[PDB]
Design a protein around this ligand. Structure first.
Ligand SMILES: [K+]
Ligand SMILES: [K+]
Lengths: 342, 329, 342, 329
């Protein structure tokens, strides 16, 4: 017999240009915390397999992992509806999954196979899903993209919001400020999330770079603060008050020892695991066995993803333009013609 | 009826904006000011804040914001004061807009339109004078059209709004106040000029003259001078830069046996180069009785003084000199 | 008899991240402020001559006049050396002059004649002078440029600063924020100057936009504190403290009637005049004579600038590359060649 | 000695830095990290923070800084991680560096070098595989080189630094670790390659094969496969995209009577277009016994799948097929 729900303290946010921030106390239901664990574990295991498929060279080109950051994508997806929008830079395996796609299609696009979510045309950086505007290879390019998805929101008035993410590397992009200004100016429901997984900036207070836009600093290893500060920021935006910065302080696992003392004293899966255990929300065996289901999940997908045939050559030209009649595309020399269908 | 190129475009957006509430205009000074070149005159007054949006001077930003809206599902007409300014946003156009449908294996289309004056004006000096036809037309996933006269302008602007992919429209500012005869079939709010097709603005049998934008006008001037000595030019208005209508140019070269391209901007790796390269690769190479040549802008950044600038853009003199050089007459 | 010098109050600047700003009191030495007059006056009459040359159509394309702001461009030259660096955008007539150029070569460049300072090649926006990197027409591009010139300063270490100016219109250029960042980050001797002469910006507190970079807000109708500020900023930078922002508040003349109240309540020239006079630093008739002198300099120049013949067309391809052997340049068609010499 | 392209470049930058203190290097991970591609290895350790500056990721801004320094007398080497990232600074290169010498009436030179890897890499997908030969090649007041082997990269990077105007150097990532015999005269520190001059890499008589950067290697491969069959190619390595050495290509054409150009960029408006257009317009034309063909990149945004990618850049057979086609053998 397990509790149904418990109550924890989450760290308190720092504020900038805000009166009151998200509550320091929250409720985790049993059946919920069970769902957040299976998601965190899946993203973790997923990236582990990616990383392994990638020292083996089945995965070519870029391969950015987000293991260590699972509190971020799962907790964010905890705080928003499926009808809200999210767009990120290239570290997007976690978000592709929380936003709908299956570990099957994600791994198969990583190994560039026909079964992949973009038919193997995209690779690791460009994956799209229902309301997910992908990862974009160009640093900060997605922030004005996000501001625009936000503008569309207001434009249809459905009280949907936009999570527009960028890491601390991209926090000095000129475009970013160009979007802070318009966002405030047009009061766009855009939440500008800065993933700060820890020189380059003259100022490392990121939640404040917005300047005239209010921001909050959140702890990104606690799935609960993330969900909290997200529901808070969603609230704020939907109430028509315009844009907000939210610095998610986090840590990507990929000296290699600073990487260590940050894992025992705060994997973000271990934290949620200890909470559930210490408050009778779940048993250590329950969780240990969800791992076994997740590990077998990822194993079968990975298997499909290395077996799956490459796309056919004759489709190299497809999907250039949308809704057009078929046409030909020139290849390496003029005698090479590739059909292109929308 | 007579309508200036400026008005033809303004009609086009007006019919589009009415027909579809997904459609919206944004750029600098497009709204309250009536347009930097009065191209959106009265649109803000009629459709409001929501639909006609004055932006700050933040090109990389608003181009970004436009492309975003298009991805989320709106149909933004994103105006650049002039295309020299788009160089700051060129990356949102090439990398966010133009390659996205394809990277997503057909999952995510980007119904944006980018428009503004392009190429040379009058005494704006080097940083405002540049032609971009060749740079854009170079990129898969884009469509690039370059209207000349009123009728072109209203057709290709409606076509592009209705198109579902990113389409860059290269207007010409010196064309804006030129009035043209406006056939009644053009005033129709069902007017559409299909992208990818050229127009033959003058049948002829001696030489083929191909050109796009303002200098199409000057080829019609050179052709009237010339048929006073019985040289008949075939003048082709390209209209689309990508994907160009090379068939048409080939048909005509098979008839005339000669070819001249007149383009506005710089010579090297320019629009002429591509028609010329194609012409050699294609079937019509063997109908060519003399080498095809190119008439371009002079190969320097654009200078200020009137006489210097007057010799930096092709003039009717140079089109004729070239044609005669080709026809070896 | 006359005053050798006098003491005045200037408005005190608003401060951003600074404890003490520039003095609220200064000393204009009658002899200096006789030169500040003649200069301001020269700029005013030139800009008015240009405007008339332009309404006539002897000037083409762009013609950006800086009248009302003469206190800025003369005030600036008064608190920096000849050997410091200045770059602005396209409203650069005042500066070109205060930096060394004769009214003749400025006028002649506008009317597009060989006797122009750039031999007709450049016209209104692209005038270059000694340690003036001129006017630039891409809004905002001048700012990272000037940060560069500042880099150059620090790098030679000869205590020179660099004044990088931009207009409240360009204040939202992404690159400007990229340049504030590296400026701060490497402590460049760069003074960022916003000529704010009053929808576009969600914060019209320009002097604070630099965020981590300290700023001050000046009254740019008053050549006295403009000078003071500039001495204050210049000195700040020389001593290694790094970058700094200056909002110069002003009002260009180029209804006609808010323009009218601004002019008779605070023309920069009028204000200086009532100060020179109402403290015996100079005579209304003394000033009435230099008015007659400048009228003649302008008349001499407008005369030269409309009498000088165009540039020769055999020099169209000159000055593409510096320091190379001569070569040819293709003109309108392949039979037109132009000689290019360095 | 055999040195790799990566090492060649390093030698060049190091020697030039040593020779002149007005010369510095800025860019992303150039300093501590040792080069994003290990190209600037050890330079920071040897010249310090004044001379090797790590920059934040702010292309539009740091390109613009280098140009400022340049304008003020400094001799900056400005690096872009890949040239795809240059799309953000492109305004700064074109509008501030390239046109300035001319706009100032020769008052204001801009001795700046822009270097980085360009074009296709390997499964870096559509946004990090663009070629820019064509676009930069297009602009007056800029010089544009595209080096192939060690010898080239060291010579050219050295002449670019010495040059007093903005030079754009299009390196290539796959060439980085490829090693080459490095003649004793190239190990010198006065080893210089004149900009504006192609190199015949292989004497031949049956056909001219002009190419630039990486695919030059595949041409030599083709040429060796094809001589086993009695067909000789003159293979030419442009080196320089602008001002490209057309004399050399014509002279070879006058002997061979055939021309195939080969390049990794997109096809239309590319480097191959300007070369043919030039052959046709010049005196080499009449020597042609068959039309000049172009072999280029496939006209798509670059895919990810290994098989699709492979047919997106020109393979050694594709070249052989166009050579055979042209000689109708
Ligand atoms: K569209
Ligand atoms: K140089």
């Amino acid at each position: 017999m397990f509790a149904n729900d418990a109550t924890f303290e989450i760290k308190k946010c720092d504020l900038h240009r805000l009166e009151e921030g998200p509550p320091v106390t929250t409720v985790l239901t049993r059946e919920d915390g069970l769902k957040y664990y299976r998601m965190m574990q899946t993203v973790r295991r997923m990236e582990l397999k990616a990383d392994q498929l990638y020292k083996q060279k089945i995965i070519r080109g870029f391969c950015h992992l987000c293991d260590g950051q699972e509190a971020c994508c799962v907790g964010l997806e905890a705080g928003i509806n499926p009808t809200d929008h999210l767009i990120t830079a290239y570290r997007a395996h976690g978000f592709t999954f929380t936003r709908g796609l299956s570990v099957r299609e994600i791994l198969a696009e990583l190994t560039g196979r026909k079964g992949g979510c973009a038919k193997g045309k995209g690779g690791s950086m460009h994956m799209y899903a229902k309301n997910f505007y992908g990862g974009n290879g160009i640093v900060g390019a997605q922030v004005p993209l996000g501001a625009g998805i936000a503008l569309a929101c207001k434009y249809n008035g459905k009280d949907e919001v936009c999570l527009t993410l960028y890491g601390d590397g991209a926090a000095n992009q000129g475009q970013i400020f160009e979007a802070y200004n318009m966002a405030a100016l047009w009061k766009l429901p855009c939440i500008f999330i800065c993933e700060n997984n820890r020189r380059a900036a003259a100022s490392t207070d990121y939640y404040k770079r917005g300047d005239f836009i209010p921001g909050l600093r959140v702890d990104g290893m606690d799935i609960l603060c993330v969900r909290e500060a997200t529901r808070f920021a969603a609230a704020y935006c939907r109430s028509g008050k315009g844009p907000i910065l939210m610095e998610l302080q986090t840590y990507r696992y990929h000296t290699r020892e600073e990487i260590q003392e940050v894992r025992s004293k705060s994997d973000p899966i271990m934290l949620l695991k200890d909470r559930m255990v210490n408050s009778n929300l779940a048993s250590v065996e329950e969780l240990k066995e969800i791992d076994v289901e997740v590990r077998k999940e990822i194993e079968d997908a990975a298997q499909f993803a290395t077996a799956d045939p490459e796309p056919p050559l004759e489709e190299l030209g497809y999907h250039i333009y949308s809704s057009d009649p078929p046409f030909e595309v020139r290849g390496a020399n003029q005698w090479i013609k590739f059909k292109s269908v929308s | 009826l007579q309508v200036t190129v400026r008005d033809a475009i303004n009609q086009g957006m007006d019919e589009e904006l009415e027909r579809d509430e997904k459609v919206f205009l944004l750029g600098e000074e497009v709204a309250q000011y009536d347009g930097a070149y009065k191209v959106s005159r009265g649109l803000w007054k009629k459709y409001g804040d929501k639909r006609i949006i004055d932006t700050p001077i933040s090109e990389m930003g608003f181009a970004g914001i436009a492309v975003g809206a298009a991805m989320a599902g709106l149909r933004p007409i994103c105006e650049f004061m002039t295309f020299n300014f788009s160089m700051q946003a060129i990356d949102q156009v090439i990398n966010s807009a133009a390659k996205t449908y394809y990277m997503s294996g057909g999952l995510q289309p980007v119904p944006i339109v980018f428009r503004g004056p392009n190429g040379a004006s009058a005494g704006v000096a080097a940083q405002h004078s540049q032609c971009f036809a060749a740079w854009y037309g170079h990129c898969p996933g884009l469509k690039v059209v370059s209207p000349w006269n009123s009728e072109d302008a209203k057709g290709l602007i409606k076509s592009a709004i209705r198109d579902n992919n990113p389409v860059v429209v290269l207007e010409n500012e010196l064309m804006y106040g030129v009035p043209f005869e406006f056939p009644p079939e053009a005033q129709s709010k069902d007017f559409l000029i299909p992208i990818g097709k050229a127009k033959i603005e003058r049948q002829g049998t001696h030489i083929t003259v191909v050109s796009h934008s303002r200098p199409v006008g000057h080829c019609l001037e050179a052709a009237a001078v010339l048929s006073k000595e019985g040289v008949e030019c075939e003048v082709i208005n390209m209209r689309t830069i990508r994907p160009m209508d090379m068939e048409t140019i080939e048909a005509s070269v098979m008839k005339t046996n000669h070819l001249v391209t007149v383009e506005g901007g710089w010579p090297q790796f320019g629009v002429g180069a591509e028609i010329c390269a194609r012409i050699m690769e294609g079937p019509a190479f063997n109908f060519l009785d003399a080498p095809a040549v190119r008439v371009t802008g002079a190969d320097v950044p654009m200078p200020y003084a009137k006489i210097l600038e007057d010799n930096s853009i092709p003039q009717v003199k140079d089109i004729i000199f070239a044609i005669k050089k080709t026809l070896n007459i």
